[PDB]
Design a binder for this molecule. Structure first.
Ligand SMILES: Nc1ncnc2c1ncn2[C@H]1C[C@H](O)[C@@H](COP(=O)(O)OP(=O)(O)OP(=O)(O)O)O1
Ligand SMILES: [Ca+2]
Length: 430
DNA sequence: ATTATGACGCG
DNA sequence: TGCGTCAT
Protein backbone atom coordinates (compact mmCIF):
# COMPACT_ATOMS: atom_id res chain seq x y z
CA UNK A 1 0.00 0.00 0.00
CA UNK A 2 1.45 3.32 1.27
CA UNK A 3 4.82 1.75 2.11
CA UNK A 4 5.42 -0.31 -1.03
CA UNK A 5 8.21 1.32 -3.05
CA UNK A 6 7.52 1.58 -6.77
CA UNK A 7 10.96 2.49 -8.09
CA UNK A 8 9.68 5.67 -9.72
CA UNK A 9 12.17 7.98 -7.99
CA UNK A 10 14.46 8.70 -10.95
CA UNK A 11 14.33 9.52 -14.64
CA UNK A 12 17.06 7.58 -16.49
CA UNK A 13 17.80 7.40 -20.20
CA UNK A 14 19.99 5.13 -22.27
CA UNK A 15 21.28 6.49 -25.58
CA UNK A 16 22.56 3.94 -28.10
CA UNK A 17 24.07 5.04 -31.45
CA UNK A 18 22.54 3.32 -34.49
CA UNK A 19 24.88 0.95 -36.37
CA UNK A 20 27.71 3.03 -34.95
CA UNK A 21 30.87 2.04 -36.84
CA UNK A 22 28.86 2.11 -40.06
CA UNK A 23 27.70 5.68 -39.42
CA UNK A 24 31.29 6.71 -38.70
CA UNK A 25 32.36 5.32 -42.07
CA UNK A 26 29.31 6.80 -43.86
CA UNK A 27 29.95 10.29 -42.53
CA UNK A 28 33.50 10.05 -43.87
CA UNK A 29 32.57 8.51 -47.23
CA UNK A 30 29.25 9.83 -48.60
CA UNK A 31 29.24 7.04 -51.24
CA UNK A 32 28.30 4.68 -48.40
CA UNK A 33 25.30 6.72 -47.21
CA UNK A 34 21.83 5.17 -47.52
CA UNK A 35 23.30 1.91 -48.84
CA UNK A 36 23.51 -1.68 -47.66
CA UNK A 37 26.96 -1.54 -46.14
CA UNK A 38 29.04 -3.08 -43.39
CA UNK A 39 32.28 -2.53 -41.53
CA UNK A 40 34.78 -5.38 -41.72
CA UNK A 41 38.14 -6.17 -40.15
CA UNK A 42 40.93 -8.16 -41.89
CA UNK A 43 40.14 -8.70 -45.60
CA UNK A 44 42.27 -11.80 -46.36
CA UNK A 45 40.42 -14.50 -44.43
CA UNK A 46 37.01 -15.11 -46.03
CA UNK A 47 36.62 -11.46 -47.01
CA UNK A 48 36.98 -10.21 -43.45
CA UNK A 49 34.86 -10.40 -40.31
CA UNK A 50 31.79 -8.14 -40.21
CA UNK A 51 31.54 -6.05 -37.05
CA UNK A 52 28.79 -3.55 -37.93
CA UNK A 53 25.88 -3.53 -40.41
CA UNK A 54 23.65 -0.78 -41.85
CA UNK A 55 19.91 -1.25 -41.51
CA UNK A 56 19.64 -1.48 -45.31
CA UNK A 57 22.03 -4.46 -45.23
CA UNK A 58 20.26 -6.08 -42.26
CA UNK A 59 17.16 -6.39 -44.47
CA UNK A 60 19.15 -8.89 -46.55
CA UNK A 61 20.08 -10.91 -43.45
CA UNK A 62 23.61 -9.59 -43.08
CA UNK A 63 24.75 -9.79 -39.47
CA UNK A 64 27.72 -9.22 -37.19
CA UNK A 65 30.19 -12.14 -36.95
CA UNK A 66 29.42 -13.12 -40.54
CA UNK A 67 32.35 -13.43 -42.97
CA UNK A 68 32.09 -10.83 -45.75
CA UNK A 69 32.30 -13.57 -48.38
CA UNK A 70 29.17 -15.07 -46.84
CA UNK A 71 27.45 -11.69 -46.46
CA UNK A 72 28.00 -11.15 -50.20
CA UNK A 73 26.00 -14.32 -50.86
CA UNK A 74 22.98 -12.72 -49.17
CA UNK A 75 23.65 -9.20 -50.44
CA UNK A 76 25.79 -9.08 -53.61
CA UNK A 77 25.73 -5.27 -53.71
CA UNK A 78 26.91 -4.99 -50.10
CA UNK A 79 29.39 -2.13 -49.73
CA UNK A 80 32.26 -2.50 -47.28
CA UNK A 81 34.44 -0.21 -45.19
CA UNK A 82 37.61 -1.64 -43.63
CA UNK A 83 38.88 -1.06 -40.11
CA UNK A 84 42.27 0.68 -40.16
CA UNK A 85 45.29 -1.54 -39.63
CA UNK A 86 48.45 -0.36 -37.93
CA UNK A 87 51.42 -2.30 -36.57
CA UNK A 88 49.95 -5.52 -37.92
CA UNK A 89 46.62 -5.20 -36.09
CA UNK A 90 43.17 -3.63 -36.34
CA UNK A 91 43.19 -0.15 -34.87
CA UNK A 92 39.91 1.26 -33.55
CA UNK A 93 41.02 4.87 -33.00
CA UNK A 94 38.57 6.41 -35.49
CA UNK A 95 35.63 4.89 -33.60
CA UNK A 96 37.00 5.80 -30.16
CA UNK A 97 37.36 9.42 -31.29
CA UNK A 98 33.85 9.47 -32.77
CA UNK A 99 32.60 8.15 -29.43
CA UNK A 100 34.24 11.02 -27.59
CA UNK A 101 32.38 13.42 -29.91
CA UNK A 102 29.03 12.03 -28.83
CA UNK A 103 29.86 11.59 -25.15
CA UNK A 104 30.99 15.21 -24.87
CA UNK A 105 27.70 16.45 -26.37
CA UNK A 106 25.65 14.28 -24.02
CA UNK A 107 27.60 15.59 -21.05
CA UNK A 108 26.26 19.09 -21.77
CA UNK A 109 22.78 17.91 -20.79
CA UNK A 110 23.53 15.72 -17.79
CA UNK A 111 26.03 13.53 -15.98
CA UNK A 112 26.62 10.41 -18.05
CA UNK A 113 27.83 6.88 -17.44
CA UNK A 114 29.82 5.56 -20.41
CA UNK A 115 28.42 2.06 -20.87
CA UNK A 116 30.31 1.13 -24.03
CA UNK A 117 31.89 2.73 -27.09
CA UNK A 118 28.49 3.93 -28.29
CA UNK A 119 26.12 3.81 -25.29
CA UNK A 120 25.68 6.09 -22.31
CA UNK A 121 23.24 6.24 -19.41
CA UNK A 122 21.94 9.64 -18.37
CA UNK A 123 20.39 10.54 -15.02
CA UNK A 124 17.82 13.17 -15.94
CA UNK A 125 16.11 13.47 -12.56
CA UNK A 126 17.48 16.95 -11.80
CA UNK A 127 17.12 18.27 -15.36
CA UNK A 128 13.50 17.17 -15.39
CA UNK A 129 12.76 19.03 -12.16
CA UNK A 130 14.26 22.22 -13.60
CA UNK A 131 12.36 21.96 -16.90
CA UNK A 132 9.12 21.30 -15.01
CA UNK A 133 9.66 24.54 -13.09
CA UNK A 134 10.15 26.51 -16.31
CA UNK A 135 7.03 24.90 -17.81
CA UNK A 136 4.85 26.03 -14.90
CA UNK A 137 1.85 23.74 -15.38
CA UNK A 138 1.98 24.26 -19.14
CA UNK A 139 0.90 21.15 -21.12
CA UNK A 140 3.37 19.15 -23.19
CA UNK A 141 2.75 19.33 -26.94
CA UNK A 142 3.13 16.22 -29.10
CA UNK A 143 5.27 18.45 -31.29
CA UNK A 144 7.95 18.28 -28.58
CA UNK A 145 8.09 14.49 -28.99
CA UNK A 146 8.48 13.97 -32.76
CA UNK A 147 10.30 10.63 -32.55
CA UNK A 148 8.92 9.19 -29.27
CA UNK A 149 6.99 5.94 -28.81
CA UNK A 150 4.99 5.25 -25.66
CA UNK A 151 5.30 1.52 -25.01
CA UNK A 152 1.93 -0.16 -24.57
CA UNK A 153 -0.04 2.44 -26.51
CA UNK A 154 -2.23 2.88 -28.36
CA UNK A 155 -4.69 0.51 -26.67
CA UNK A 156 -8.42 0.04 -26.17
CA UNK A 157 -11.53 1.24 -28.07
CA UNK A 158 -4.24 3.86 -39.15
CA UNK A 159 -2.34 0.87 -40.50
CA UNK A 160 1.03 2.63 -40.83
CA UNK A 161 3.86 2.77 -38.29
CA UNK A 162 3.97 6.55 -37.85
CA UNK A 163 0.20 6.69 -37.51
CA UNK A 164 0.37 4.21 -34.65
CA UNK A 165 3.18 6.15 -32.96
CA UNK A 166 1.13 9.35 -32.95
CA UNK A 167 -2.04 7.61 -31.80
CA UNK A 168 -0.16 6.15 -28.84
CA UNK A 169 1.49 9.47 -28.06
CA UNK A 170 -1.86 11.25 -28.19
CA UNK A 171 -3.45 8.81 -25.74
CA UNK A 172 -0.51 9.21 -23.37
CA UNK A 173 -0.54 13.00 -23.44
CA UNK A 174 -4.33 13.18 -23.20
CA UNK A 175 -4.15 11.22 -19.95
CA UNK A 176 -1.23 13.17 -18.48
CA UNK A 177 -1.83 15.22 -15.33
CA UNK A 178 0.51 18.18 -15.83
CA UNK A 179 -0.80 19.64 -12.58
CA UNK A 180 1.42 17.54 -10.31
CA UNK A 181 5.18 18.18 -10.49
CA UNK A 182 5.76 14.86 -8.71
CA UNK A 183 3.79 12.63 -11.09
CA UNK A 184 6.27 9.96 -12.26
CA UNK A 185 4.59 9.70 -15.67
CA UNK A 186 4.89 13.46 -16.17
CA UNK A 187 8.53 13.31 -15.11
CA UNK A 188 9.23 10.58 -17.68
CA UNK A 189 7.49 12.65 -20.34
CA UNK A 190 9.62 15.70 -19.62
CA UNK A 191 12.61 13.36 -19.66
CA UNK A 192 11.62 12.27 -23.15
CA UNK A 193 11.41 15.91 -24.25
CA UNK A 194 14.95 16.49 -23.04
CA UNK A 195 16.17 13.33 -24.77
CA UNK A 196 14.59 14.53 -28.03
CA UNK A 197 16.67 17.69 -27.57
CA UNK A 198 19.82 15.71 -26.74
CA UNK A 199 19.40 13.44 -29.76
CA UNK A 200 18.80 16.46 -32.01
CA UNK A 201 22.04 18.05 -30.78
CA UNK A 202 23.98 14.83 -31.39
CA UNK A 203 22.70 14.64 -34.94
CA UNK A 204 23.21 18.34 -35.69
CA UNK A 205 26.74 18.40 -34.29
CA UNK A 206 28.11 15.03 -35.46
CA UNK A 207 25.80 13.81 -38.21
CA UNK A 208 25.13 10.65 -36.16
CA UNK A 209 21.65 9.26 -35.40
CA UNK A 210 20.77 7.23 -32.32
CA UNK A 211 17.94 5.59 -30.43
CA UNK A 212 17.12 6.08 -26.75
CA UNK A 213 15.07 4.59 -23.94
CA UNK A 214 13.53 6.67 -21.16
CA UNK A 215 12.31 5.05 -17.94
CA UNK A 216 12.85 5.00 -14.17
CA UNK A 217 16.06 2.93 -14.09
CA UNK A 218 18.94 1.66 -16.23
CA UNK A 219 17.55 -1.79 -17.00
CA UNK A 220 14.19 -0.47 -18.22
CA UNK A 221 15.86 2.35 -20.14
CA UNK A 222 18.09 -0.14 -21.95
CA UNK A 223 15.14 -2.43 -22.66
CA UNK A 224 13.09 0.53 -23.85
CA UNK A 225 15.84 1.74 -26.18
CA UNK A 226 15.79 -1.47 -28.22
CA UNK A 227 12.03 -1.44 -28.72
CA UNK A 228 12.06 1.06 -31.59
CA UNK A 229 15.35 1.24 -33.48
CA UNK A 230 16.70 2.97 -35.42
CA UNK A 231 16.44 6.74 -34.99
CA UNK A 232 13.57 6.62 -32.46
CA UNK A 233 13.13 6.80 -28.71
CA UNK A 234 10.82 4.88 -26.40
CA UNK A 235 9.30 5.77 -23.04
CA UNK A 236 8.56 2.81 -20.77
CA UNK A 237 6.39 3.87 -17.86
CA UNK A 238 6.08 1.97 -14.59
CA UNK A 239 2.49 1.15 -15.53
CA UNK A 240 3.58 -0.42 -18.81
CA UNK A 241 5.69 -3.04 -17.03
CA UNK A 242 3.18 -5.83 -16.28
CA UNK A 243 2.03 -6.11 -19.91
CA UNK A 244 5.53 -5.60 -21.34
CA UNK A 245 7.01 -8.28 -19.10
CA UNK A 246 4.15 -10.74 -19.59
CA UNK A 247 5.61 -11.97 -22.88
CA UNK A 248 9.22 -10.77 -22.52
CA UNK A 249 11.78 -13.56 -22.72
CA UNK A 250 14.00 -13.52 -19.64
CA UNK A 251 17.17 -13.32 -21.78
CA UNK A 252 16.14 -9.90 -23.07
CA UNK A 253 16.80 -8.19 -19.74
CA UNK A 254 20.33 -6.89 -19.18
CA UNK A 255 22.49 -9.36 -17.19
CA UNK A 256 20.15 -12.28 -17.90
CA UNK A 257 21.30 -12.94 -21.48
CA UNK A 258 23.70 -15.69 -20.41
CA UNK A 259 24.11 -18.58 -17.97
CA UNK A 260 22.21 -16.95 -15.09
CA UNK A 261 19.17 -16.26 -17.26
CA UNK A 262 19.30 -19.83 -18.53
CA UNK A 263 19.39 -21.07 -14.93
CA UNK A 264 16.39 -18.91 -13.99
CA UNK A 265 14.46 -20.49 -16.86
CA UNK A 266 15.53 -24.05 -16.11
CA UNK A 267 15.23 -24.00 -12.33
CA UNK A 268 11.93 -22.13 -12.13
CA UNK A 269 10.38 -23.62 -15.26
CA UNK A 270 9.32 -20.25 -16.65
CA UNK A 271 9.98 -18.31 -19.86
CA UNK A 272 8.94 -14.68 -19.36
CA UNK A 273 10.09 -11.94 -17.03
CA UNK A 274 6.60 -11.38 -15.61
CA UNK A 275 6.40 -14.96 -14.38
CA UNK A 276 9.06 -14.11 -11.80
CA UNK A 277 6.53 -12.18 -9.70
CA UNK A 278 5.06 -15.41 -8.32
CA UNK A 279 8.13 -16.29 -6.24
CA UNK A 280 9.01 -14.82 -2.86
CA UNK A 281 12.23 -12.85 -2.45
CA UNK A 282 13.61 -15.69 -0.27
CA UNK A 283 12.73 -18.28 -2.90
CA UNK A 284 14.69 -16.34 -5.51
CA UNK A 285 17.60 -15.83 -3.14
CA UNK A 286 17.60 -19.56 -2.43
CA UNK A 287 18.36 -20.40 -6.05
CA UNK A 288 20.33 -17.43 -7.32
CA UNK A 289 21.99 -16.00 -4.22
CA UNK A 290 21.17 -13.09 -1.92
CA UNK A 291 22.20 -10.35 -4.34
CA UNK A 292 20.71 -11.80 -7.55
CA UNK A 293 17.59 -12.95 -5.74
CA UNK A 294 16.81 -9.50 -4.37
CA UNK A 295 17.64 -7.98 -7.74
CA UNK A 296 15.28 -10.36 -9.57
CA UNK A 297 12.50 -9.81 -7.05
CA UNK A 298 12.55 -6.07 -7.63
CA UNK A 299 13.38 -6.16 -11.35
CA UNK A 300 10.42 -8.30 -12.40
CA UNK A 301 8.27 -5.56 -10.84
CA UNK A 302 10.10 -2.90 -12.88
CA UNK A 303 12.24 -1.80 -9.94
CA UNK A 304 16.03 -1.47 -9.89
CA UNK A 305 18.40 0.84 -8.04
CA UNK A 306 21.79 0.67 -9.79
CA UNK A 307 22.90 4.31 -9.99
CA UNK A 308 24.06 6.13 -13.10
CA UNK A 309 27.75 6.37 -12.25
CA UNK A 310 29.51 9.68 -12.90
CA UNK A 311 32.05 8.30 -15.36
CA UNK A 312 32.64 9.49 -18.92
CA UNK A 313 36.09 7.96 -19.49
CA UNK A 314 36.98 4.28 -19.82
CA UNK A 315 38.68 2.75 -16.73
CA UNK A 316 41.12 0.69 -18.79
CA UNK A 317 43.01 1.04 -22.05
CA UNK A 318 43.89 -2.23 -23.70
CA UNK A 319 44.84 -3.86 -26.94
CA UNK A 320 44.86 -7.44 -28.08
CA UNK A 321 45.42 -9.69 -31.04
CA UNK A 322 44.53 -13.28 -31.82
CA UNK A 323 46.90 -15.59 -33.67
CA UNK A 324 44.51 -18.34 -34.84
CA UNK A 325 45.18 -21.83 -36.20
CA UNK A 326 48.40 -21.76 -38.19
CA UNK A 327 49.50 -18.26 -37.16
CA UNK A 328 49.93 -19.23 -33.49
CA UNK A 329 53.16 -17.71 -32.15
CA UNK A 330 55.69 -20.51 -31.68
CA UNK A 331 59.00 -18.70 -31.14
CA UNK A 332 60.21 -16.44 -28.33
CA UNK A 333 61.19 -13.97 -31.07
CA UNK A 334 57.64 -13.84 -32.44
CA UNK A 335 56.16 -13.43 -28.97
CA UNK A 336 58.57 -10.53 -28.42
CA UNK A 337 57.88 -8.72 -31.68
CA UNK A 338 54.10 -8.88 -31.30
CA UNK A 339 54.20 -7.80 -27.67
CA UNK A 340 56.15 -4.80 -28.92
CA UNK A 341 53.56 -3.96 -31.57
CA UNK A 342 50.80 -4.08 -28.95
CA UNK A 343 52.92 -2.02 -26.56
CA UNK A 344 53.54 0.66 -29.18
CA UNK A 345 49.82 1.08 -29.80
CA UNK A 346 49.21 1.11 -26.03
CA UNK A 347 51.95 3.72 -25.51
CA UNK A 348 50.39 5.95 -28.15
CA UNK A 349 46.93 5.72 -26.63
CA UNK A 350 48.22 6.15 -23.09
CA UNK A 351 50.23 9.26 -23.91
CA UNK A 352 47.19 10.84 -25.55
CA UNK A 353 45.06 9.80 -22.58
CA UNK A 354 47.50 11.41 -20.12
CA UNK A 355 47.52 14.70 -22.04
CA UNK A 356 43.75 14.86 -22.46
CA UNK A 357 42.55 13.50 -19.15
CA UNK A 358 45.16 14.35 -16.52
CA UNK A 359 45.68 10.80 -15.32
CA UNK A 360 48.23 8.00 -15.49
CA UNK A 361 47.84 4.22 -15.53
CA UNK A 362 49.81 2.45 -12.81
CA UNK A 363 49.33 -1.22 -13.62
CA UNK A 364 50.01 -3.25 -16.74
CA UNK A 365 47.96 -6.41 -17.17
CA UNK A 366 49.34 -9.10 -19.48
CA UNK A 367 47.14 -11.92 -20.75
CA UNK A 368 47.69 -14.76 -23.19
CA UNK A 369 45.90 -17.77 -24.59
CA UNK A 370 47.46 -21.18 -25.21
CA UNK A 371 46.43 -23.35 -28.15
CA UNK A 372 43.61 -25.75 -27.29
CA UNK A 373 42.07 -23.85 -24.38
CA UNK A 374 38.38 -23.11 -24.99
CA UNK A 375 38.64 -20.15 -22.62
CA UNK A 376 39.12 -16.70 -24.15
CA UNK A 377 41.98 -16.17 -21.69
CA UNK A 378 44.28 -18.87 -20.35
CA UNK A 379 46.28 -16.63 -18.04
CA UNK A 380 46.59 -13.11 -16.60
CA UNK A 381 49.51 -11.51 -14.78
CA UNK A 382 50.20 -7.94 -13.71
CA UNK A 383 53.28 -5.78 -13.24
CA UNK A 384 53.97 -2.14 -12.46
CA UNK A 385 53.35 0.40 -15.21
CA UNK A 386 55.91 3.01 -14.21
CA UNK A 387 56.86 4.54 -17.57
CA UNK A 388 54.89 5.16 -20.75
CA UNK A 389 57.55 3.42 -22.85
CA UNK A 390 56.62 0.79 -25.42
CA UNK A 391 59.95 -1.03 -25.24
CA UNK A 392 59.83 -1.16 -21.44
CA UNK A 393 56.20 -2.25 -21.30
CA UNK A 394 56.78 -5.02 -23.87
CA UNK A 395 59.91 -6.20 -22.07
CA UNK A 396 58.09 -6.31 -18.73
CA UNK A 397 55.16 -8.15 -20.27
CA UNK A 398 57.53 -10.78 -21.65
CA UNK A 399 59.39 -11.16 -18.36
CA UNK A 400 55.99 -11.78 -16.76
CA UNK A 401 54.85 -14.49 -19.21
CA UNK A 402 58.15 -16.09 -20.26
CA UNK A 403 57.68 -18.76 -17.58
CA UNK A 404 54.79 -20.20 -19.60
CA UNK A 405 57.07 -21.62 -22.27
CA UNK A 406 57.07 -25.38 -21.63
CA UNK A 407 59.72 -25.71 -24.34
CA UNK A 408 63.07 -27.31 -23.59
CA UNK A 409 64.83 -25.59 -26.45
CA UNK A 410 65.43 -22.01 -25.27
CA UNK A 411 64.51 -20.45 -28.62
CA UNK A 412 61.09 -22.02 -29.26
CA UNK A 413 57.71 -21.51 -27.55
CA UNK A 414 55.31 -24.27 -26.48
CA UNK A 415 52.51 -24.57 -26.63
CA UNK A 416 51.99 -21.84 -29.26
CA UNK A 417 50.19 -18.66 -28.15
CA UNK A 418 46.89 -17.90 -29.88
CA UNK A 419 46.20 -14.54 -28.19
CA UNK A 420 48.18 -11.64 -26.71
CA UNK A 421 46.57 -8.91 -24.57
CA UNK A 422 48.05 -5.81 -22.88
CA UNK A 423 45.89 -3.61 -20.69
CA UNK A 424 46.69 -0.45 -18.75
CA UNK A 425 44.69 -0.08 -15.54
CA UNK A 426 44.50 1.54 -12.10
CA UNK A 427 44.58 5.20 -13.09
CA UNK A 428 45.68 7.93 -10.70
CA UNK A 429 45.37 11.69 -11.15
CA UNK A 430 48.39 13.42 -12.70
C1' DA B 1 40.02 -18.63 -37.99
C1' DT B 2 35.33 -13.96 -35.34
C1' DT B 3 38.06 -10.19 -33.34
C1' DA B 4 38.82 -6.31 -30.46
C1' DT B 5 37.43 -4.40 -26.97
C1' DG B 6 35.34 -3.01 -21.80
C1' DA B 7 33.00 -3.37 -16.75
C1' DC B 8 32.02 -5.90 -12.67
C1' DG B 9 31.23 -9.74 -8.82
C1' DC B 10 33.12 -13.66 -6.36
C1' DG B 11 36.50 -15.24 -3.64
C1' DT C 1 44.97 -10.75 -6.15
C1' DG C 2 42.86 -14.01 -11.07
C1' DC C 3 38.83 -15.80 -13.19
C1' DG C 4 34.38 -16.05 -14.98
C1' DT C 5 30.53 -13.69 -16.73
C1' DC C 6 28.09 -10.42 -19.50
C1' DA C 7 28.11 -6.96 -22.54
C1' DT C 8 29.39 -3.66 -27.06
N1 LIG D 1 31.28 -8.38 -31.02
C1 LIG D 1 31.85 -7.24 -31.49
N2 LIG D 1 33.12 -7.26 -32.00
C2 LIG D 1 33.69 -6.14 -32.46
N3 LIG D 1 33.04 -4.97 -32.44
C3 LIG D 1 31.78 -4.91 -31.95
C4 LIG D 1 31.15 -6.05 -31.46
N4 LIG D 1 29.91 -5.69 -31.05
C5 LIG D 1 29.78 -4.35 -31.28
N5 LIG D 1 30.92 -3.90 -31.83
C6 LIG D 1 31.23 -2.51 -32.24
C7 LIG D 1 30.71 -2.19 -33.64
C8 LIG D 1 29.38 -1.52 -33.37
O1 LIG D 1 28.99 -0.62 -34.42
C9 LIG D 1 29.62 -0.80 -32.05
C10 LIG D 1 28.31 -0.67 -31.29
O2 LIG D 1 27.79 -1.98 -31.08
P1 LIG D 1 26.22 -2.29 -30.99
O3 LIG D 1 25.52 -1.20 -30.25
O4 LIG D 1 26.08 -3.68 -30.43
O5 LIG D 1 25.66 -2.39 -32.50
P2 LIG D 1 25.50 -1.24 -33.61
O6 LIG D 1 25.63 0.14 -33.02
O7 LIG D 1 26.38 -1.59 -34.78
O8 LIG D 1 24.00 -1.50 -34.10
P3 LIG D 1 22.62 -1.05 -33.36
O9 LIG D 1 22.03 -0.04 -34.29
O10 LIG D 1 21.88 -2.36 -33.30
O11 LIG D 1 22.96 -0.52 -32.00
O12 LIG D 1 30.55 -1.63 -31.33
CA1 LIG E 1 24.57 0.83 -31.05
Amino acid sequence: GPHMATGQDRVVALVDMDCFFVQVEQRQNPHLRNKPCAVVQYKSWKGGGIIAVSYEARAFGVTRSMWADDAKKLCPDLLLAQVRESRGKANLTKYREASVEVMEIMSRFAVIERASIDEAYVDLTSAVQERLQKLQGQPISADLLPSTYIEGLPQGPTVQKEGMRKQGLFQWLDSLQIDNLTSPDLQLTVGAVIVEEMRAAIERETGFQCSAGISHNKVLAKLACGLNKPNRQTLVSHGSVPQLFSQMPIRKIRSLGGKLGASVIEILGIEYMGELTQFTESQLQSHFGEKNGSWLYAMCRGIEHDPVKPRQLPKTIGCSKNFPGKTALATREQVQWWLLQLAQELEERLTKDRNDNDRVATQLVVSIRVQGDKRLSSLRRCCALTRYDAHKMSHDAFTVIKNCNTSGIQTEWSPPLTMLFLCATKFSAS
